[PDB]
């Protein structure tokens, strides 16, 4: 049964507004003039005015930029001195722009490793979240990297981090508590699979007995 498909509108759109989205028509306009109006969130119930229509032509318009991370989808109902048609469900989908950076769940992550641990030993896990669409885009696909290690002894790279999981592991023998009891790592989480927006955090690794 012929229905209007979901209307997709990207967020963060620039001017000028109003901007046309879709036109709806009732073939009952053949006999006489029809008055169009829409209801729902974004037009009737809050929020208000985001989506409007002009009753003479039936052009569904948007009047201000959208934000997918607030309202991801709208559902409206189009209408036509008497009712002409049973209401039509008009679904509006806000498509994603990469406008949020990955954030670590905390600023400092604590972790501990045993001295003499063999390479591959899991030390700790850092975690970040990105608020963008991680199912239809890469705007939330996070890669983890190590930006620095302090100190650089016995080796410059005592640890590695898994690009996808954030697990930090030992890669080199020689961890010694009496020698170097603490390591500080700056970790970065970037979206677009590591090529996009980033933030940093700190991992503090204590070497135990």
């Amino acid at each position: 049964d012929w229905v209007i498909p979901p209307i997709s509108c990207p967020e963060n759109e620039k001017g000028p507004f109003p901007k046309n989205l879709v036109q709806i028509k009732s073939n009952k306009d053949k006999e006489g003039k029809v008055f169009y109006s829409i209801t729902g969130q974004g037009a009737d119930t809050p929020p208000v005015g985001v989506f409007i229509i002009e009753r003479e032509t039936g052009w569904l318009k948007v009047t201000e930029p959208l934000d997918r991370e607030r309202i991801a989808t709208y559902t409206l109902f189009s209408h036509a001195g008497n009712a002409v048609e049973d209401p039509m469900e008009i679904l509006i989908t806000v498509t994603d722009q990469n406008d949020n950076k990955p954030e670590f769940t905390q600023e400092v992550f604590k972790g501990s490793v045993m001295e003499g641990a063999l390479p591959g030993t899991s030390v700790m896990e850092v975690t970040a979240t990105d608020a963008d669409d991680d199912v239809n885009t890469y705007n939330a696909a996070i890669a983890y990297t190590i930006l620095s290690q302090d100190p650089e002894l016995p080796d410059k790279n005592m640890f590695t981090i898994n690009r996808n999981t954030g697990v930090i592991s030992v890669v080199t023998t020689g961890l010694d508590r009496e020698s170097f009891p603490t390591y500080t790592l700056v970790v970065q989480a970037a979206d677009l699979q590591g090529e996009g927006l980033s933030t940093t955090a700190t991992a503090v690794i204590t070497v135990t007995d």
Partner: antibody
Amino acid sequence: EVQLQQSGPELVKPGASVKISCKASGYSFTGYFMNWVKQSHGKSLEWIGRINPYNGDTFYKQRFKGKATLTVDKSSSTVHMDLLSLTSEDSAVYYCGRGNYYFDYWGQGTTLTVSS
Amino acid sequence: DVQITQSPSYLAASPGETITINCRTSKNISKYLAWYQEKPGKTNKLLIYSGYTLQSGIPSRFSGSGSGTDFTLTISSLEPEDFAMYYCQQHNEYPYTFGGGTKLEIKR
């Protein structure tokens, strides 16, 4: 107390090159990216690029590739910026600043005058 | 590149007043905008980072707001020290970029 101390003013003829240095202290040097910012007289601030002191990894603003080279010397907690094939348009104050994103500490600036 | 329009360029006020400085950006940069203060003979001073986070050592009469494309630095109850040059900078993405600046001069 963090402190970024820059090298003194440079007066060079056009066509020459200069290396401006910035020495950091008061914090773990490799923990923060270092940045260079240009400010021409009367003009606004312009970010040139950064370097990761841990591994020398650099990123440049496009219009400074081939004009600016960033290097680092970990043993002395110093970052260097090379400016090549200098012109009067290069005459400016140049700042180093600490930070991977925003710059919570700045140097006092180095003045470059390019004139024959 | 993220272009930033910082307005106004010049602004005259007296101690005790509240003033605002605005930066509009050409891309949605979420919250990642920072404000700096410039004074002769002093290294530049970070006031706010990430839109509204007050930096250590800065009094709370400096406050930031906004997210997306419109940001405001607000300075309440101006002290004589506050009359200076002010810059915003987006720290959202390379290349980092700055607003054109605002000179806060003292009424007379």
